[model samples]
Target chain A: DSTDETPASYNLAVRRAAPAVVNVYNRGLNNQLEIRTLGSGVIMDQRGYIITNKHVINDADQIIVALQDGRVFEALLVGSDSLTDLAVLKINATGGLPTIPINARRVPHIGDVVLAIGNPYNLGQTITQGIISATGRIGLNPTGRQNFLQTDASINPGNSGGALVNSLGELMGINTLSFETPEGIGFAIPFQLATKIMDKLIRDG
Target chain B: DSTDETPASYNLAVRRAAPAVVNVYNRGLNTNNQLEIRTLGSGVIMDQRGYIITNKHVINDADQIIVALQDGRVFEALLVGSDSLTDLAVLKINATGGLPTIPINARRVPHIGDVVLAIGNPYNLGQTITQGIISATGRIGLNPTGRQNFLQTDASINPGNSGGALVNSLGELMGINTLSFDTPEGIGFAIPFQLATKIMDKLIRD
Candidate 1:
């Protein structure tokens, strides 16, 4: 048996963060359990809380969260906020669940290297990289308080509700949107903002 | 006055290799002094001798070729030769001073899942770097005409990114960024650095 020498990679970050990122399948009102839409989610706690985009779970008759380790769980919608387009889910799992790494004091700066972990197009845990292009990007409704962090990372349709982490494998934001017409631009909800919304959803529900 | 702490970036790779990647503008035949840009792409400086490698299609109908370096140096390049099957072309520039060449480690072999950065000019916006892992390695081309062992990645290679540099996290050139399939996203292909160099050497000699 031969062990290959280590290659140059950000796999350390992938190892630390990828486990907590899960695939979300939305079976919309289908009795046969056919998947209508899909996205990704991040496990927030050992208590089975997960954070995903509200649009992902919208009109979902059944929400399924599949971990990278091949464990699947039917999730319960805790709450969803339309304004932020964020939702919280809970899975009733007995075993310890991996949670995304977070650094509360870490400040997001422009030009920071980031990796977007998601199940884009149901491709099963894909990671794309880019730099933080700009901070506090306003959404379609310019008047709304959408503090979207813009990046050049490739965030495809199925990447919604994914986790965007830094090179250190710390959660920086929750991936929410990818510009349709433009090629590289993507947006994520700042982790601080995501944290606030996740708390509010849990508290209110 | 306060200066902010430098943000964490792959700027080490950016600084080491980016300068060697240049924006290639193809200006077809013009009637007057002002020539409209027919197409745009990117190229990599292969050596200090000013030999560059770019996609063949970018300069196929070119009346003039312009290569813009990162250091505000622009030069009109000469199309030395082009291969129809590989869609690769070699350009030569005449420069007086030392030119930065892309970092290369001939012995380093790229593996699947190794982090790669694609440096290119997309839609002529500017030099942009997108990141992804080497999804696979080998010949997976669906088309027969362009059939070659390509380095597949998910590094978001868009229009004008063709012929740019696909480099590893350590700033070593791994391949030449090429076409991307559109039916699904996150899939882009590149000509492996080893083969690209082979083609470059053959084109230069012939």
Candidate 2:
């Protein structure tokens, strides 16, 4: 008999919407021809408008989105904002994409258990477990932007533009950059910013 | 137009020295109730006796010596002999400590810009490259070993970069590096093999 037990509420969330997270692939011109690059993104709405990092899909000639169940579809690039380094793309699939629960009101606190799900190093859909290392870190961007959620999660080169989800599998933020000198240092774009940009993209589109 | 136009000479020397040069770090036990670390030295070996050549200052009270290679192989080492006056130390690596070995022969020829490479982790690259000409050959009082005729080269040497080899173009052992200048570029010193041979013989005799 184990003393530690998973809460009853955790199982319900897993059963409801576990198959919606998808992997993103971009083929773009480096020198002249196209080369394939992999990144991770999350589906925000039912209409297949996925959110990912702009750096991952920028200048790509083609984008391929793959569901958790290995189903892939060609996605059309909607617009990308280079300031926040965020991009939104849409795919027209037969069945609509599953929507992730959003906890927009309260900001996630530091030390919260988070999951970084993405296609790290083209290894397919993978989830890395870690805790929020810090909160409200400032001036990380070359453009002098501030207030980033830092985590020690094992995000890597190919993990650019993946989802940093809370334990409940709710979307919290998007994994952005990792410090080159320090191991386990990663930054994420807060959910408030993500929602505002995503909302505007939906309204304008 | 000048006459000495050898474009590939420096490139070839850099490549040859990159593999034999290594990075060294000294870690000591917290005897003073605090963790302290020291970094310095360039080293070479005369044989597979597991005997390594380095500066004495790099190994003083070094409870442990770590030899890291460009390929990322690390090994714990032991100090077999040290002469502070000459600023020289001979470290022995055990069987389990698989350090890369380069061949050294007394009969090896030493030529000016005959092609040589300096292999070492300059900024902890495990092993890095710097190539140049053997600018001059003679003695200096810098080494702990009072007797000194040294080989001067124009390779870029830096801190934590002592005891590495100054090799000939054929990748043959030429000399053991000892000192370099901070303000100058490509100005470095190495113990001439003629003097290094005597030191190796003295260590072996003992």
Candidate 3:
């Protein structure tokens, strides 16, 4: 497509970012029969450091992370912050791992376009696009801080802990959960809020 | 030196749309329990004959509805009827002189990433402008409306923002803001103008 004509596809961002997004599978059940949970995560460091929502693996006996390149690894829980709903994990790296960058320093505009990449409903790596609808959206009282980057992009079950990236494929936030009522309206932990939590997790864990 | 016009200020759009928005006060007995209550919301004037529209929930089950303008003029509102299907209600107030109206543009197809501003009285705090982008269109699957395509915006919608105006950058009234659900505060929905105008015509006729 020519530069003058705006292309319809946001493939550049997804093609660059998808490789770093991983599907997180939580297995085992301590109570009742058994249960398996699924969510998403983004690779934060080249040395196998990762970040995801705490609730994703809060009760899991085992956390399995699967990459797009067909590589799966057992992830060790580094440290987690319940107040921020953020958790840091690490997998033993056999080699250099691709990393996704967090763009916390850049100020965000409300109307900026963004994309959500995650394994929604355990469907594998998926990408959906929309715009940042609002910022500093204080979510529910159940958990975490209220400063979230609310987006209109479609987020579904199993999308928790996924990555919300800008057009350049840089991490803007982490797709957490939508408002309890509406299905399409979803919120993400803004990079600014998630950054401090992540730094502490890395330092402590 | 003259500066480039930017969306950051949104001064002109605010000037154009805010006047057409009037605070709607609802006086009713709390249905869930028991209490004498007065609630406030926002409404957009649709015509000079004093036709105003707002969310059905705004004036729903109210003993009296009062329409107050920015100029502090207050008039008792008549419930012309409301459609629960769209969460919309039409109210008429008597006015000897013509009422100021914001231009309505329903013909423009809403784009996914279009910039929008929501003007309303949120939490009874007076008229305020909340800005955001259109995140999605034809949003469905929410209850109360099985198959209605509602416009979803990220603009902060407070408890009293119901029936307010969600305007495009040009300050034209695009839809009536209504929240079917809450929590995770940013997710808000609005009934598009195309559907609203049709309902207004019907309400005016019958």
Candidate 4:
């Protein structure tokens, strides 16, 4: 075996968080069954509960979740919240599944480095990076209640439901929206709020 | 000074190279006989001789080109030369004080998957730094001409980011930020430093 020093990377964060990010497929039964790449999802725990964007599973007759390790499972919709653009999916797997790193006590600052892991363009697992441009950003929703974590990371259509982790590999937010025109601006659901909704969805559903 | 803990950052690289990345403003004479800003982009100081590198498109058809530094110095720069094929241009300024130059390591080779930071004036956002990894090297860009071989990256790059610095974690220049694909998100391209330096030497000599 040949040994060489690996190139500089944020692989520490990628290794810890990317395995938990999965491809979400939305399938429709037109005649037989039509399948399309929807977006992405983050495995929250070993129970196979996953979090994705509410827009991802909309109008789907069937939902499929594929992990980085090649395991695929038909997921059941647990719950969805329109305000936060969040949805939860549940899958039953025999083996243990990797979960994203989380630290409840960690506070994400405005300038802290972050990595966005997802399947952009269904191009397989891709990791992009940026700093937290802002926090508590108001979305286009007129209600003004949806507070999002803003970042400059390149989050595309397929990246919508993926994990935004810090340099330490800790979950910071869930990528939810991208401002397309001027570019270089994106928003995510803060991890604290995401976890709060996850517990609520799991408890109620 | 008050004692406080610092947050996690790439300030090491930021400190080392950001000062050399300057905002370039292309101005034109308006009806009022005053120079008004027409277009804007970013540039990097290459040497102590006050040589700067920026996108040719950024300074096109400008009556005057003004450069503002991070340290509050402003200079009226003279267009040295431009190469349209590569979209690179050189400018010269004469200042009494020494100017900060971007960190350059001629021997350092940029590899795929290496972490990089793009420092630029995005949407005139005032010196924003976005991070990403070099996705691919020697990529033929999406242009119809296909004249450029670029270092593809996932870094967030926009209109105003043209001609900015794409640097490694150590603040060494990797390339000059160039074009990005609109259809494919997260795909931006930069001219490799070696190629940029080659052209710079060519333009400066001639």
Q: Find the 10 residues in a row with the least total lDDT in model 4 chain A.
A: A137-146
Structure candidate 4, residue pairs in collision: none
Overall lDDT per candidate, in order of appearance: 0.86, 0.66, 0.78, 0.85
2 against 3, candidate with superior DockQ: 3
Tens-place lDDT digits, model 1, residues A75-102: 9999999988999999999889999988
Model 2 docking grade? incorrect
Q: Which fraction of the native contacts appears in each prediction? A: 0.21, 0.00, 0.00, 0.31
Clashing pairs in 3: none
lDDT tens digits by residue: candidate 3, A38-72: 89998987778888989898887888999999999
* Span of 10 residues, lowest total lDDT, candidate 3 chain A: A137-146
Higher-TM-score candidate of 1 and 2:
1
Per-residue alpha-carbon lDDT of candidate 4 for residues B146-173, written as tens digits (9 for 90 to 100): 7557888987788888999999889999
The clash tally of candidate 3 reads 0
lDDT of 2 by residue, B171-190 (tens): 66778777675535567777
| By DockQ: ranked, best first | 4, 1, 3, 2
Interface Cα RMSD for all candidates? Answer: 6.8, 24.4, 8.8, 6.6
Best by DockQ: 4
The candidates score, on chain A by TM-score, as follows: 0.92, 0.84, 0.87, 0.91
